[PDB]
From a paper:
Large single crystals of a Hyp-1–ANS complex were obtained by co-crystallization with an eightfold molar excess of the ligand. The maps show excellent electron density for either one, two or three internal ANS molecules (at sites designated 1, 2 and 3) per Hyp-1 protein and 29 interstitial ANS molecules. Two ligands are bound in internal chambers (sites 1 and 2) and one in a deep surface pocket (site 3) formed by residues Lys33 and Tyr150. Sites 1, 2 and 3 are occupied in 22, 25 and 13, respectively, of the 28 protein molecules in the asymmetric unit. The structure shows three clearly defined and separated ligand-binding sites, and the fact that the complex stoichiometry can be 1:1, 1:2 or 1:3 has to be taken into account as a complication when studying the kinetics and stoichiometry of PR-10–ligand complexes using ANS displacement fluorescence. Fortunately, the structure shows that there is no direct interaction between the fluorescing species to further complicate the spectra. The Hyp-1 molecules are arranged into dimers through intermolecular β-sheet formation between β1–β1 strands, although the protein is monomeric in solution. Seven of these dimers have the same orientation and nearly equal repetitive spacing along the c axis, while the remaining seven are their copies through a noncrystallographic 21 axis in the c direction. Rigid-body refinement of the 28 copies of the protein molecule in the C2 solution confirmed that this solution does not obey any higher symmetry, though it is pseudo-symmetric with pseudo-tetragonal symmetry. The final electron-density maps are of very good quality, showing unambiguously the main-chain trace of all 28 independent protein molecules (A, B, … Z, a, b), clear conformations for most side chains and good density for all copies of the C-terminal helix α3, which is often disordered in PR-10 structures.
Hyp-1 is a 165-residue pathogenesis-related class 10 (PR-10) protein from the medicinal herb St John’s wort (Hypericum perforatum). The mystery shrouding the function of PR-10 proteins is in contrast to their comprehensive structural characterization, which reveals an almost hollow molecular core surrounded by a seven-stranded antiparallel β-sheet gripped around a long α-helix (α3) supported at the C-terminus by a fork of two shorter helices. This characteristic fold, termed the PR-10 fold (or the Bet v 1 fold after birch pollen allergen, which was the first PR-10 protein to have its crystal structure solved) strongly suggests the binding/storage of hydrophobic ligands. Hyp-1 has been postulated to catalyze the oxidative coupling of emodin to hypericin, the main pharmacological ingredient of St John’s wort, although this enzymatic activity has been questioned.
Numbering used by the authors: 1 to 159
Write the structure that this text describes.
């Protein structure tokens, strides 16, 4: 209050159900698949796949960042809908309390329409860097481009 937020709207030739599974439900695992150079493991530490499930993504040894943990706060997996929060790990940078992601997908002929909102939460009475915004939008977005391309040339996967 006030918080920094991106609002993006995208579309890819990939059906929502395949994207929501690769970029949400099994993200922790798909990150170690598209970027084996920068991530060692991604796991669930308690939970199912439902609100309160916590994941852990661990960086490779020669990376500056250390690990991340996210909590699943709202899933409606049928509707392609997720709100999830980066709460812990060396990743955070000092003026931001958490990062809060809200995803909804929808089908669109042969593919997808995502609307994503990423809200950057400063810690008690601090300010949020705008460089981090641009870094957080480039790192998620390339990863999506790697995944898209990948779900594109193997229709089999998550299909
Ligand atoms: O990493 S990605 O292709 O992005 C990927 C994205 C989403 C789901 C995946 C499932 C299996 C293997 C993958 N990759 C992979 C690639 C070559 C060999 C083994 C696995 C998946
Ligand atoms: O927008 S991104 O920054 O990659 C992004 C960031 C965070 C979570 C996302 C979840 C699903 C799809 C995304 N992108 C997307 C791309 C194409 C079509 C629909 C969604 C997500
Ligand atoms: O992209 S950033 O991290 O923002 C970045 C920002 C500024 C300078 C960078 C130099 C090399 C690699 C980067 N990225 C990178 C990240 C992980 C693995 C390898 C390279 C740099
Ligand atoms: O963005 S994510 O989608 O989690 C992501 C996806 C793929 C690779 C990433 C590497 C480093 C940091 C990330 N996140 C991040 C968090 C805050 C600021 C900048 C980057 C990465």
């Amino acid at each position: 209050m006030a918080a920094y937020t991106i609002v993006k709207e995208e579309e890819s030739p990939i059906a929502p159900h395949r994207l929501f599974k690769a970029l949400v439900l099994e993200r922790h695992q798909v990150l170690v698949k598209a970027q084996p150079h920068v991530f060692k493991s991604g796991e669930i530490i308690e939970g199912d796949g439902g609100v309160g499930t916590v994941t852990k993504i661990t960086f490779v040894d020669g990376h500056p960042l250390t690990y991340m943990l996210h909590k699943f706060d709202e899933i409606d997996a049928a509707n392609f809908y997720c709100k999830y929060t980066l709460f812990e790990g060396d990743v955070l940078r000092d003026n931001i309390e958490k990062v809060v992601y809200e995803v909804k997908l929808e089908a669109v002929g042969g593919g997808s329409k995502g609307k994503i909102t990423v809200t950057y939460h400063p810690k008690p009475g601090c300010t949020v860097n705008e460089e981090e915004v641009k870094i957080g939008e480039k790192k998620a977005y390339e990863f999506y481009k790697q995944v898209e391309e990948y779900l594109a040339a193997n229709p089999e996967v998550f299909a």
